[PDB]
């Protein structure tokens, strides 16, 4: 049950689903809690006094912000997610996410194409690193992006290729996916010639 | 005798005049005529009036005002009626044609049952006596028309629920407001007055066309005339129901449009794959079809031929087709810029720049094919081109045409857009156009963000309208919560529309966050309603809004418009930015816009003329000097464009008639090659872009557009008939009128320029500091017009800022979710009603005040092209065509440019308004208006006569003031502050004159003593004006350089400044210190509050303020606190005996709800034929609300102080509005006067240049030394005649006490700490204390006057004191001055350190042993453990000192303390015990962790209510931690200052307080019996008894914050540094 | 207070350091269709309005050093 914080029914919605899963052993996830500082130090001060089910979590998914409570960061564990340290990491992860049925389609080609929309989300979010040379500014070159790509990549894939097995270098739709890239995908968030 | 003829007209008019009556339904006989009945009303009060005004009037005039009454009751009557009357009528429909209401709301209808009967018999009694007089005599018609209006507005207001679910009937009554839907429902029988509610419910159908009968729809039509004729007809009565026939009537019109749709493709086929097309079968077929179906086909045709020229091209090395199509497409566009460059009626010639603006993107589309050589169908250079198929095998009609994007496709919606305003094909919009196709097929909303002005709405609408689609554009702001959110989410959801939402960031992170959960929920419905699988025939996709299963139409989309960057807004979260795709628009195809438009437009030279004009647009921002109203975007350049197409529309129209009246010869071709372009364009710049100029950037532009245009001239036309009327309006309203460099030639020109503005944009905005003639400009161009075209013009004067944004748009209740209008929108929903024939006239909303994001981006839609205003509840309100918003401000340093380049900007400098103009407009209106309301007329004009020589351009008062702006003063210096004091001066010389002859009867003052008189006034006028608000050392500067340049006779001393010099009525000098008798006091008031001792400041200051307060000016006083500023003014208003004073005491948190309540409280709301007056309850009497900290409420983040803006509003506009029903109401015999510290102090922030504009400022500085010295040696020489022995020592003590004094307000500052303040109010406190000390002594050595001077000395000076070295500094100081000051004294016996004096021991007040005092300390110690606290104590020095002052505190009427030191240190404690033993009723409110506003608002009545209606002392104890809101220091500020609360007893609980006062006045045998009388008493009892006593904490940043928050604890409250224990 | 000498110093080589004169450009009916002109009319007077206001702020600040003249709310929020 996935829940996004910053309404009184929010609240009210958050607090029943919580009791529902503790009892019923129910994931419950709550977005952007670092807008209610307040109802984070009622919402820790209730979970330390209960005993829920063993498969039950919950997760409080929110921004690095100095007003969430220390009570609630001592309280829970806390992972920190942040651009990957390296491109390996950062192919690593895109590879990770992306299912692996979904790179193993019936063209054999596709793989390849995946991995160069790996490679080059990388390049891109590593050299966003480098904010005044890499790029202009700080774009927001995310996960989105990247999702983007890959359902873009699949759809002009399967156009072009009916259903067959392998498909020539020469035939892939190099002019969609580039401009699509260039105009859409990622040249959305550019506001720089 | 002609009033009697107007009169027997009159009489015959009315006793011949019957209402109009028509049969309604065989019901009742309802009222028809209003507009007439309410014309003739209006023209009868009128005649009345000038009959008034004329001479003879005294013979008829009782007559004549009987008739006024009769006819303003008539008018009231029917103010009432026609409301009554149409609401009864919808809300009848509703009532009788749904069967089911009755069960749903059984109370309501029962309600409304009693009404009708109530309503069916009056209507029944006035069809009896159709007479308007008969019907006017009915007993108690008023009043019961009045219960019948709110009974109605009740049950209005209590149809909610079904309205909801009538909505849930027709999707699209979501967009309907619930007075419209109301409406609606009620009216489907008379279907005539639904025709003005179809523009909210659909995209482009204005109206709906039905037969004769109005039983069957036949068609439906849009705004400009454009009619669809449906193909089989939709009857209304098969289908009786209003949903029913609307859903329909919606059906049919899309299968309508599919077929005419497929009509016009067969037919636009032939035109396509043709060498030559006919240009009359093009035209023909053009009228034939409408706008949108006439560009789609074209735009199917083109694709089509594309198809089939890429699909012959497919064989790859095959010849190429394309350059046929391209052929094809350019002699289609040839013909029509040949049709545009003749006549062509209006619609014809939209539909003709539709078509060549579809036709010049084809043609670049085509070319960029051509060139990169495509030949394959699959090409993605042809792909990501919009392509159109049409497909007529196709059995369902509605899904025919497939428009396809990439890999998106779409089917058309159908919906009648009728002919909106298409964008040109820029590669910006191409690519917006591909990324939000995009995001659509990916089921994801569009984001177009980027700066203001890039067109991003715009072309979201384009993309709607290009697929057919529902688009509907919100204006967001904070207000759009969930529900409301919600409820729109729901709308769009059920019509199939697209919700394009502006300002999207403009909502609050945590209700963006929480919307962002309702779009994922709509986006996981559409992307299963996608799939495959699904078939349309099962169950249909549903989503969870609002906790309810609501379907998903396929059609809608979410799309939000951002300006990222900027004033207010807020930053979305991370998982509502991944719900949508992103896209930065920032740099417009200008060049291709501004070619396209003119090419559009018939212009020949399109390309040279925008390669001429963008590179000047991006000049001119590189150019003129930066400006915060400065705005050169793509806005201005369509508005040039636009202005330039109307004014060579307007141009060939003009060579036409004259070709006509000059003999007989018209050729358009011609015309059009014998046309300047080139100085149209030039025209419309210089309309369009100089009046927002200033004077240095005006050369810069004419060089700028010399450079790019040379060779043509700008000649501004001569608007003669205007000019005449201005000259007219002027005249009447004593202004000057000035024909080029004449004087007033610039203030006329920015007045046509802001005329030419108000023909081109609907939002105006008048830029210029205070003082620039703004206001007039706007005034008299209304009047002109008015009276040039004869159609009345009506001004609704706005403050934006004197309100709450809530009441200023209006508010959604959170729980009932019912929304109430504020004043804008009230206002606006009021013309567009145009109940009263509002539509009819010229309405001029003008929001006269600052402009800051938060509340102008509301207003964005309505200043767009949308002119719409959007409202959280769903609601949008058009915009009427005769509406015209103007921004009257004085700078735009807060407004965004999203703000700035929405309104036409009309700049206002200084220098059009000379000061020879305000002062000739000074001299005509004394010479024109008497003062009193003749003598007086002979005496202003001669007086006037004698003031013209000064008041010229070189003169005296313009040198004076010139150099006075040199001075440096209190406060800002502006031109009409002094020149508003100087008139204001001159008028009071004016009464004094009038006053002289009135008590000389038989000898009134001749003109050569009056022209003294006038000139030496002038003079000591001028100093005071121009250098009241100065210290002295400038007003002797400015009086110096008067005495170098003026001419008039001045004082012959040598040293002695002229501001020490009155003029006696005699016309001559006199010093002021003739008006300064050195009195004697008597003994039993010795620095008693009432008691002034005159010194030469107080005299010069007292007439000061009273020759301002006599002319009823608001006015302040500003000085270092303690100068004399409230002893002054009341010293002043004591010679003004028909003036009362009420003393409203401002904090940090001071809003406008003060003023509001001291307005319930003290005076009274009627109503009155010209509106609603507030008036004081008191006749007679003048009400002046003294503001004592007027500078200190808080200025916002934007620079503006509401309570500010709100007296400035009821002191230049003489009233307010009241938000419980949004009405001006005027103010009448209500006066301001304020006093503030200097802007300067610590927590004091500079007045805005407007409102000191209207008050003059005068500075009340320290008494110096001599006149410190003066004052409390006359005290202390009325003090000790008590005691004989000591006379003699009365004129060393006071230079001691003064001595002390002076070096202490030298030692201890404010730059130390915050409460280092010493005043004057220390030596008058110091004077009592050794007044009371030595009242009840018989005799006395000077040892015990010394020992006593000590004491206070000490309890004065060393208790706020905080650290050691400051005391131990004050002990030695005082130690020395006393020596000095009264030698031959034994040291030992006057300054033993332990200086201790209580009358606990004793019956007076006499020095106290400090071991006897400890021992009586811990005996009452002992008793006080038994009876009230059992807490022990430790008896030290430091306790028995602080009890000590506590004791002398409470033992004051109104002496309240201020405890400040480290918590558990025994303040409350010592408290509690010395209230106790003073018999003191310790108070503390009992504060929790529920406490609220009204809980402490509940303590402080019962406080209040046994303080003063029950006579019992009160020690009120108050922590610093019991303050848990800035509410409580509000009223605990207002509490110390005054002793009351305004606002604390109101309703019942104030009713059951007077009762009590009763009883208490009765108790103490007072007899009182008025209401005003009793609070009074009360109030006097309250300061009597009640003592406060607040403790704290000693912080530095929370003593600094107090300081400002409620200055009544460091003004008010003695403060006491206990600190740690040492 | 150290803080208030250390910015007494501070004030006075910030004066030492700033230029003190800036003469301003006159206009002509010629100039005025010479863009350089036009450019460094407007330069020259946002030049010297800057500089008379900060050395205007930086004496205030130093004769505040000295305690000629008292503090006030502009001039507290330029100090801090
Ligand atoms: N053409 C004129 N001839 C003579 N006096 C004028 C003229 N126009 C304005 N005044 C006077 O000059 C003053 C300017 O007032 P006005 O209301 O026009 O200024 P404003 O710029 O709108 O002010 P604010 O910003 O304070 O509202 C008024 O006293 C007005 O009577
Ligand atoms: N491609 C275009 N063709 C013609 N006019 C355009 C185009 N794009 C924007 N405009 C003009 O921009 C003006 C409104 O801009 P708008 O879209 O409201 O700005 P914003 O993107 O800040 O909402 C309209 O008058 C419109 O004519
Ligand atoms: N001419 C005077 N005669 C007697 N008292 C004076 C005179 N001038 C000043 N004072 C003293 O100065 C004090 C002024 O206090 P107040 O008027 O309340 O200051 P403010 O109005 O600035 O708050 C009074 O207490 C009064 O005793
Ligand atoms: N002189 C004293 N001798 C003994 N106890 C004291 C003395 N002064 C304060 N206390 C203690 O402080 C407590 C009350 O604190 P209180 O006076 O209410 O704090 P505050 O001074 O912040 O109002 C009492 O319980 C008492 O024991
Ligand atoms: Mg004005």
């Given at each position: 049950?996935?829940?996004?914080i910053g309404?009184?029914?929010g ?5 029943k689903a919580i ?5 019923s052993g129910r994931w419950?996830?709550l977005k952007?809690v670092?807008?209610?500082?307040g109802?984070?130090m009622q ?7 209960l005993?829920p089910?063993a498969?039950?979590?919950?997760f409080?998914?929110?921004?690095i ?7 609630l960061?001592?309280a ?6 942040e651009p990957?340290?390296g491109?390996?990491?950062?192919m690593l992860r ?6 692996v ?6 063209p054999n080609?596709?793989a ?7 490679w080059?989300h990388?390049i891109i979010?590593?050299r966003l690193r480098?904010?005044p040379?890499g ?5 927001e070159?995310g996960?989105?992006?990247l999702?983007?790509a890959?359902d873009t ?6 156009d072009?290729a009916?259903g067959r097995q ?5 035939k892939i739709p190099?002019?969609a996916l580039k401009?699509?890239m260039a105009?859409?995908?990622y040249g959305g968030?550019?506001?720089?010639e | 005798?002609?009033?009697?003829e107007?009169?027997?007209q009159?009489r015959?008019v009315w006793?011949t005049?019957?209402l109009?009556?028509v049969?309604?339904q065989?019901?009742c006989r ?8 309410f014309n003739?009303?209006?023209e009868h009060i ?5 009959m008034k005004?004329?001479?003879y ?6 007559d004549?005002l009987?008739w006024?009454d009769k006819?303003?009751?008539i008018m009231?009557?029917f103010?009432?009626?026609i409301?009554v009357?149409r609401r009864?009528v919808?809300?009848e429909?509703?009532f ?6 009755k069960?749903l709301?059984?109370?309501?209808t029962?309600?409304?049952?009693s009404?009708?009967?109530?309503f069916?018999?009056?209507?029944k009694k006035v069809?009896?006596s159709?007479?308007?007089?008969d019907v ?6 008023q009043?019961?028309?009045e219960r019948?209006?709110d009974?109605?507005?009740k049950?209005?207001?209590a ?9 849930s009937?027709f999707?699209?009554?979501?967009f ?15 279907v005539?007055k639904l025709?003005?509610?179809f ?9 709906i ?9 036949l ?8 009619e669809v ?9 098969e289908?009786?129901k209003?949903?029913?026939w609307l859903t329909?009537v ?5 299968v ?5 749709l497929?009509?016009?493709?067969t ?7 043709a060498?030559?097309?006919?240009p009359?079968?093009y035209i ?11 560009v789609l086909?074209?735009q199917i ?9 890429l699909?012959?091209?497919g064989?790859?090395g095959?010849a ?6 391209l052929?094809?497409?350019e ?5 029509l810029?040949?049709?545009v460059?003749?006549?062509q009626?209006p ?12 036709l010049?993107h084809?043609?670049?589309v085509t ?5 990169s ?12 081109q919009?392509?159109f198929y049409?497909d007529?095998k196709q059995?369902d009609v509605?899904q025919?045409?497939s ?6 496709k779409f089917?058309?919606?159908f919906?009648?857009?009728?002919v909106?305003?298409?964008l ?5 919009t191409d690519?917006?156009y591909?990324?939000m196709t995009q995001?659509l097929?990916?089921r994801l909303?569009?984001?177009p963000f980027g700066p203001?002005?890039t067109?991003?709405?715009?072309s979201?609408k ?17 207000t759009?919560?969930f529900?409301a959110?919600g409820?729109?989410?729901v709308?769009?959801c059920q ?7 502006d300002?999207?960031?403009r909502?609050e992170?945590?209700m963006?966050?929480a919307?962002?959960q309702?779009?994922?929920?709509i ?5 299963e309603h996608?799939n495959?699988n699904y078939?349309?025939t099962?169950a249909p996709?549903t989503?969870e809004?609002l906790?309810k299963?609501?379907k998903?139409?396929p059609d ?6 951002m300006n990222?960057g900027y004033?207010g807004?807020?930053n979305?979260?991370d998982?509502?930015?991944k ?6 628009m920032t740099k417009?195809?200008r060049?291709?816009?501004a070619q396209?438009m003119?090419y559009?437009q ?6 040279v ?9 991006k000049?001119?921002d ?7 109203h400065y705005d050169?975007?793509?806005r ?8 330039a197409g ?6 060939i129209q ?6 006509e ?5 018209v050729?358009e071709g011609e015309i059009?090659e014998?046309?300047?372009?080139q100085?149209i364009?030039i025209?419309?710049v210089?309309?369009?872009?100089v009046?927002?100029?200033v004077?240095?950037?005006?050369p ?6 010399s450079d790019?245009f040379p060779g043509?001239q700008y000649?501004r ?11 007219k ?6 202004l000057?009128?000035?024909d080029?460099?004449?004087?007033g ?10 005329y030419?503005?108000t023909?081109?944009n609907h939002?105006?905005?008048?830029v210029?500091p205070?003082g620039?003639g703004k206001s007039?400009?706007?005034?008299v161009?209304?009047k002109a017009?008015?009276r040039?075209?004869?159609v009345?013009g ?6 934006p800022?004197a309100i709450s ?14 929304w ?7 206002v606006?929903?009021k013309?567009?009603?145009?109940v009263r024939?509002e539509?009819q006239?010229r309405?001029?909303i ?9 509340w102008?981006?509301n207003?964005?839609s309505?200043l767009d092209?949308?002119?719409l205003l959007?409202?959280?509840?769903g609601?949008?309100?058009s915009?009427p065509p005769?509406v015209r918003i103007?921004?009257e401000?004085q700078?735009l ?9 929405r309104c036409?900007?009309?700049?206002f ?9 305000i002062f000739?407009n000074?001299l005509?209106?004394?010479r024109?208006?008497?003062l009193d309301?003749?003598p007086?007329?002979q ?11 000064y008041?010229?351009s070189?003169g005296?008062?313009?040198?004076a ?7 440096e003063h209190?406060?800002?210096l ?5 020149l508003?004091?100087?008139?204001s001066?001159?008028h009071q ?5 009038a006053?002289y002859?009135?008590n000389?009867?038989?000898?009134p ?12 006034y002038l003079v000591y006028?001028?100093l005071w004006?121009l250098?009241?608000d100065?210290?002295l050392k400038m007003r002797?500067?400015?009086?110096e ?5 003026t ?6 001393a040598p040293?002695?400044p002229?501001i020490?010099?009155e003029?006696s009525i ?7 210190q003739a008006?300064?008798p050195?009195?004697e ?13 005159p010194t ?15 002319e ?6 500003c000085?270092?606190?303690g100068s004399?500023?409230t002893?002054?003014?009341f010293?002043a208003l004591?010679?003004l005996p028909?003036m009362e004073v009420?003393?409203?005491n401002?904090?940090?948190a001071?809003?406008?709800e003060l003023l509001?309540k001291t307005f319930d409280?003290?005076?009274?709301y ?6 609603v007056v ?9 009400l002046?609300?003294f503001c004592?900290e ?5 200025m916002?983040?934007?620079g503006?102080?509401?309570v500010i803006?709100?007296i400035?509003?009821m002191?230049e506009?003489?009233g307010f ?5 949004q009405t001006?109401?005027?103010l009448?015999?209500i006066?301001f006067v304020?006093?503030?510290?200097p802007?300067?102090?610590?927590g004091?922030?500079?007045?805005s240049?407007?409102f ?7 500075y009340?500085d320290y008494?110096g030394?001599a006149?410190l ?6 005290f202390n020489?009325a003090?000790?005649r ?6 003699t020592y009365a ?7 003064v ?10 500052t404010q730059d130390t700490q915050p ?11 110091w004077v009592?204390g050794?007044?009371e000390?030595?009242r009840?002594?018989?005799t006395l050595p000077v040892?015990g006057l010394?020992?006593?001077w000590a004491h206070?000395?000490?309890?004065l000076?060393?208790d706020?004191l905080?650290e ?5 500094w ?5 130690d020395?001055?006393?020596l ?12 033993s350190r332990?200086?201790?004096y209580?009358?606990?021991?004793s019956?007076?007040?006499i020095?106290?042993?400090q071991?006897e005092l ?5 005996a009452?110690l002992?008793?006080f453990?038994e009876?009230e606290?059992?807490?022990?104590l430790?008896?030290f020095?430091?306790?028995l000192?602080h009890?000590?002052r506590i004791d002398?505190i409470?033992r004051?009427?109104?002496?309240h303390?201020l405890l400040?030191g480290?918590?558990?240190?025994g ?6 015990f010395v209230?106790?033993?003073?018999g003191l009723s310790?108070?503390?409110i009992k ?6 506003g009204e809980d ?8 209040l209510?046994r303080?003063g209606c029950?006579?019992e002392?009160?020690?009120?104890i108050?922590?610093?931690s019991?303050?848990l809101?800035?509410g409580?220091?509000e009223?605990m500020?207002?509490?110390l200052?005054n ?11 104030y009713?059951t307080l007077?009762?009590q006062?009763?009883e208490?006045?009765?108790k ?5 019996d008025?209401?005003?009388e009793?609070?009074k008493?009360?109030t006097s009892?309250?300061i009597r008894?009640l003592?406060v006593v607040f403790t704290?904490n000693?912080?530095?940043?929370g003593?600094k ?5 409620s200055?009544?604890?460091?003004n008010?409250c003695?403060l006491?540094?206990?600190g740690d224990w040492? | 207070?150290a803080?208030?000498?250390?910015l007494?110093?501070?004030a006075?080589?910030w004066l030492?350091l ?6 301003h450009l006159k206009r002509?009916?010629?100039?005025i269709?010479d863009?350089?002109?036009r450019?460094f009319?407007?330069?020259v ?7 008379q206001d900060?050395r205007?702020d ?5 004769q505040?050093?000295?305690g000629?003249?008292?503090?006030t709310?502009?001039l507290?929020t330029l100090?801090n």
């Amino acid at each position: 049950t996935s829940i996004a914080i910053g309404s009184a029914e929010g609240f009210n919605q958050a607090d029943k689903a919580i009791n529902t899963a503790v009892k019923s052993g129910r994931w419950v996830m709550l977005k952007n809690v670092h807008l209610a500082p307040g109802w984070l130090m009622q919402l820790e001060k209730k979970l330390h006094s209960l005993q829920p089910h063993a498969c039950f979590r919950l997760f409080l998914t929110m921004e690095i912000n100095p007003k969430v409570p220390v009570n609630l960061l001592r309280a829970g564990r806390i992972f920190v997610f942040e651009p990957p340290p390296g491109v390996k990491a950062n192919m690593l992860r895109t590879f990770s996410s992306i299912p692996v049925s979904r790179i193993c389609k019936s063209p054999n080609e596709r793989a390849r194409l995946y991995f160069l929309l790996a490679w080059f989300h990388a390049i891109i979010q590593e050299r966003l690193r480098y904010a005044p040379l890499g790029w202009s500014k700080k774009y927001e070159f995310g996960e989105s992006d990247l999702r983007s790509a890959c359902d873009t990549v699949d759809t002009w894939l399967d156009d072009t290729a009916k259903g067959r097995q392998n498909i020539s270098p020469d035939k892939i739709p190099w002019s969609a996916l580039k401009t699509l890239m260039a105009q859409s995908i990622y040249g959305g968030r550019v506001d720089n010639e | 005798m002609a009033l009697e003829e107007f009169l027997k007209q009159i009489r015959e008019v009315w006793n011949t005049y019957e209402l109009d009556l028509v049969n309604y339904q065989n019901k009742c006989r309802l009222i028809r005529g209003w507009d007439d009945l309410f014309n003739k009303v209006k023209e009868h009060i009128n005649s009345v009036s000038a009959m008034k005004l004329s001479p003879y009037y005294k013979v008829f005039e009782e007559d004549a005002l009987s008739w006024e009454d009769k006819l303003n009751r008539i008018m009231a009557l029917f103010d009432v009626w026609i409301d009554v009357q149409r609401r009864w009528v919808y809300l009848e429909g509703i009532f009788t044609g749904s069967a089911d209401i009755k069960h749903l709301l059984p109370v309501e209808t029962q309600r409304f049952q009693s009404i009708s009967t109530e309503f069916l018999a009056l209507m029944k009694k006035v069809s009896k006596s159709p007479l308007v007089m008969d019907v006017l005599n009915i007993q108690g018609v008023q009043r019961s028309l009045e219960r019948l209006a709110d009974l109605l507005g009740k049950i209005q207001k209590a149809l909610g629920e079904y309205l909801e679910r009538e909505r849930s009937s027709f999707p699209r009554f979501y967009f309907v407001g619930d007075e419209d839907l109301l409406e609606i429902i009620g009216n489907s029988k008379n279907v005539a007055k639904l025709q003005k509610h179809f523009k909210k419910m659909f995209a482009g159908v204005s109206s709906i066309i039905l037969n004769e009968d109005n039983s069957v729809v036949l068609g439906i039509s849009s705004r400009e005339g454009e009619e669809v004729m449906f193909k089989t007809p939709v009857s209304i009565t098969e289908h009786p129901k209003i949903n029913e026939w609307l859903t329909l009537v919606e059906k049919e019109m899309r299968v309508t449009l599919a077929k005419l749709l497929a009509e016009s493709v067969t037919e636009v086929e032939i035109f396509g794959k043709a060498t030559s097309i006919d240009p009359n079968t093009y035209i023909t077929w053009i009228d034939k079809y409408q706008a949108q179906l006439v560009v789609l086909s074209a735009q199917i045709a083109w694709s089509e031929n594309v198809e089939t020229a890429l699909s012959s091209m497919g064989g790859g090395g095959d010849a190429a087709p394309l350059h046929s199509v391209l052929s094809n497409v350019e002699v289609t566009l040839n013909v029509l810029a040949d049709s545009v460059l003749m006549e062509q009626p209006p619609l014809r010639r939209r539909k003709l720049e539709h078509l060549i603006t579809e036709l010049v993107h084809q043609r670049d589309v085509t070319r960029s094919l051509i060139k990169s050589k495509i030949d394959n169908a699959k090409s993605f250079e042809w792909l990501s081109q919009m392509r159109f198929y049409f497909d007529p095998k196709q059995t369902d009609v509605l899904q025919q045409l497939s428009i396809q994007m990439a890999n998106a496709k779409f089917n058309y919606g159908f919906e009648y857009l009728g002919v909106q305003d298409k964008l040109v094909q820029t590669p910006l919009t191409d690519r917006c156009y591909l990324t939000m196709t995009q995001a659509l097929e990916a089921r994801l909303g569009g984001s177009p963000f980027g700066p203001a002005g890039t067109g991003k709405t715009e072309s979201v609408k384009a993309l709607g309208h290009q697929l057919g689609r529902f688009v509907l554009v919100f204006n967001c702001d904070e207000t759009f919560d969930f529900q409301a959110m919600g409820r729109i989410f729901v709308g769009l959801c059920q019509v199939g529309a697209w919700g394009c939402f502006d300002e999207f960031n403009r909502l609050e992170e945590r209700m963006l966050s929480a919307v962002s959960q309702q779009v994922q929920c709509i986006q996981e419905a559409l992307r299963e309603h996608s799939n495959p699988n699904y078939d349309k025939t099962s169950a249909p996709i549903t989503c969870e809004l609002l906790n309810k299963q609501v379907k998903v139409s396929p059609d809608m989309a979410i799309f939000i418009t951002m300006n990222p960057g900027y004033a207010g807004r807020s930053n979305l979260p991370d998982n509502l930015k991944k719900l949508f795709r992103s896209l930065a628009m920032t740099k417009p195809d200008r060049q291709l816009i501004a070619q396209v438009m003119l090419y559009s437009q018939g212009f020949r030279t399109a390309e040279v003329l925008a390669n001429k004009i963008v590179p000047f647009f991006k000049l001119c921002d590189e150019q003129l000097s930066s400006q915060s109203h400065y705005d050169f975007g793509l806005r201005a350049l369509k508005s040039v464009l636009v202005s330039a197409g109307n004014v060579k529309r307007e141009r060939i129209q003009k060579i036409k008639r004259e070709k006509e009246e000059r003999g007989e010869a018209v050729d358009e071709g011609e015309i059009a090659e014998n046309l300047p372009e080139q100085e149209i364009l030039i025209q419309s710049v210089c309309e369009t872009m100089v009046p927002k100029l200033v004077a240095e950037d005006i050369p810069l532009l004419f060089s700028l557009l010399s450079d790019v245009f040379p060779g043509v001239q700008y000649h501004r036309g001569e608007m003669t008939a205007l000019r005449e009327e201005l000259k007219k309006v002027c005249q009447e309203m004593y202004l000057t009128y000035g024909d080029g460099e004449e004087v007033g030639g610039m203030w006329v020109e920015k007045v046509l320029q802001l005329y030419q503005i108000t023909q081109i944009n609907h939002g105006l905005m008048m830029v210029g500091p205070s003082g620039s003639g703004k206001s007039m400009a706007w005034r008299v161009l209304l009047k002109a017009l008015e009276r040039l075209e004869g159609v009345e013009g009506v001004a609704h004067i706005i403050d934006p800022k004197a309100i709450s944004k809530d009441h200023l748009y209006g508010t959604l209740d959170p729980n009932t979710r019912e929304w109430t209008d504020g004043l804008f929108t009230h206002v606006l929903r009021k013309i567009i009603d145009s109940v009263r024939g509002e539509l009819q006239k010229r309405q001029w909303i003008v929001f006269d005040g600052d402009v800051d994001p938060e509340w102008v981006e509301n207003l964005n839609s309505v200043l767009d092209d949308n002119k719409l205003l959007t409202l959280p509840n769903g609601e949008r309100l058009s915009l009427p065509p005769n509406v015209r918003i103007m921004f009257e401000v004085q700078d735009l340093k807060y407004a965004t440019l999203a703000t700035v380049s929405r309104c036409g900007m009309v700049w206002f400098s200084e220098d059009v308004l000379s000061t020879d103009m305000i002062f000739n407009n000074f001299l005509a209106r004394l010479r024109s208006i008497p003062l009193d309301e003749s003598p007086m007329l002979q005496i202003q004009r001669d007086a006037a006569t004698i003031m013209q020589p000064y008041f010229t351009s070189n003169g005296l008062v313009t040198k004076a003031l010139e150099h006075a702006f040199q001075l440096e003063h209190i406060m800002d210096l502006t031109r009409l502050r002094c020149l508003g004091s100087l008139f204001s001066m001159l008028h009071q010389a004016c009464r004094n004159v009038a006053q002289y002859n009135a008590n000389h009867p038989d000898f009134p003052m001749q003109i050569e003593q009056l022209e003294r008189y006038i000139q030496r006034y002038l003079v000591y006028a001028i100093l005071w004006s121009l250098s009241g608000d100065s210290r002295l050392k400038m007003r002797a500067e400015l009086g110096e350089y008067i005495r170098r340049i003026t001419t008039v006779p001045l004082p012959t001393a040598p040293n002695i400044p002229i501001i020490d010099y009155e003029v006696s009525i005699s016309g001559e000098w006199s010093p002021w210190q003739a008006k300064v008798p050195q009195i004697e006091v008597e003994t039993h008031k010795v620095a008693a509050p009432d008691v002034v001792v005159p010194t030469l400041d107080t005299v010069r200051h007292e007439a000061l303020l009273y020759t301002w307060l006599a002319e009823h000016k608001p006015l302040v006083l500003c000085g270092p606190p303690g100068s004399g500023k409230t002893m002054t003014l009341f010293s002043a208003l004591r010679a003004l005996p028909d003036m009362e004073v009420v003393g409203l005491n401002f904090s940090s948190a001071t809003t406008p709800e003060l003023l509001l309540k001291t307005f319930d409280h003290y005076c009274e709301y009627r109503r009155t034929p010209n509106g609603v007056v507030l008036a004081p309850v008191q006749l007679g009497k003048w009400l002046v609300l003294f503001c004592d900290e007027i500078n200190l409420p808080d200025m916002d983040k934007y620079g503006t102080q509401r309570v500010i803006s709100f007296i400035r509003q009821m002191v230049e506009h003489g009233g307010f509005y009241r938000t419980s029903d949004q009405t001006w109401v005027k103010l009448e015999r209500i006066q301001f006067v304020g006093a503030c510290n200097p802007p300067t102090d610590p927590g004091r922030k500079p007045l805005s240049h407007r409102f000191l504009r209207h008050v003059p400022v005068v500075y009340v500085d320290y008494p110096g030394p001599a006149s410190l010295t003066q004052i409390y040696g006359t005290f202390n020489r009325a003090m000790l005649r008590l005691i004989p022995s000591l006379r003699t020592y009365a004129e060393p003590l006071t230079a001691a006490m003064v001595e002390f004094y002076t070096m202490s307000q030298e030692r201890f500052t404010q730059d130390t700490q915050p409460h280092y303040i010493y005043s004057p109010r220390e030596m008058t406190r110091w004077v009592r204390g050794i007044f009371e000390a030595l009242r009840p002594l018989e005799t006395l050595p000077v040892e015990g006057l010394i020992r006593i001077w000590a004491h206070e000395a000490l309890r004065l000076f060393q208790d706020r004191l905080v650290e050691d070295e400051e005391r131990r500094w004050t002990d030695e100081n005082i130690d020395t001055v006393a020596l000095k000051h009264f030698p031959n004294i034994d040291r030992e016996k006057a300054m033993s350190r332990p200086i201790l004096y209580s009358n606990w021991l004793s019956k007076d007040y006499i020095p106290v042993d400090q071991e006897e005092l400890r021992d009586y300390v811990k005996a009452r110690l002992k008793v006080f453990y038994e009876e009230e606290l059992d807490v022990p104590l430790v008896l030290f020095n430091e306790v028995l000192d602080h009890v000590l002052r506590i004791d002398r505190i409470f033992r004051q009427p109104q002496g309240h303390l201020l405890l400040i030191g480290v918590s558990g240190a025994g303040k409350t404690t010592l408290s509690r015990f010395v209230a106790w033993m003073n018999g003191l009723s310790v108070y503390q409110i009992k504060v929790h962790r529920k406490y609220t506003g009204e809980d402490f608002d509940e303590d402080l009545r019962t406080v209040l209510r046994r303080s003063g209606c029950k006579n019992e002392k009160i020690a009120f104890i108050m922590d610093e931690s019991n303050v848990l809101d800035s509410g409580f220091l509000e009223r605990m500020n207002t509490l110390l200052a005054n002793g009351e609360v305004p606002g604390l007893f109101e309703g019942d609980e104030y009713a059951t307080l007077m009762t009590q006062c009763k009883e208490g006045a009765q108790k103490e045998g007072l007899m009182l019996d008025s209401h005003e009388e009793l609070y009074k008493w009360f109030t006097s009892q309250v300061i009597r008894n009640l003592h406060v006593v607040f403790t704290m904490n000693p912080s530095s940043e929370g003593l600094k914050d107090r300081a400002a928050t409620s200055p009544a604890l460091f003004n008010r409250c003695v403060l006491n540094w206990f600190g740690d224990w040492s | 207070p150290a803080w208030m000498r250390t910015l007494h110093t501070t004030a006075s080589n910030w004066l030492h350091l700033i230029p003190q004169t800036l003469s301003h450009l006159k206009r002509t009916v010629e100039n005025i269709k010479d863009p350089l002109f036009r450019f460094f009319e407007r330069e020259v007077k946002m030049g010297a309005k800057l500089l008379q206001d900060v050395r205007q702020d930086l004496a205030d600040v130093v004769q505040v050093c000295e305690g000629k003249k008292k503090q006030t709310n502009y001039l507290r929020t330029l100090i801090n």
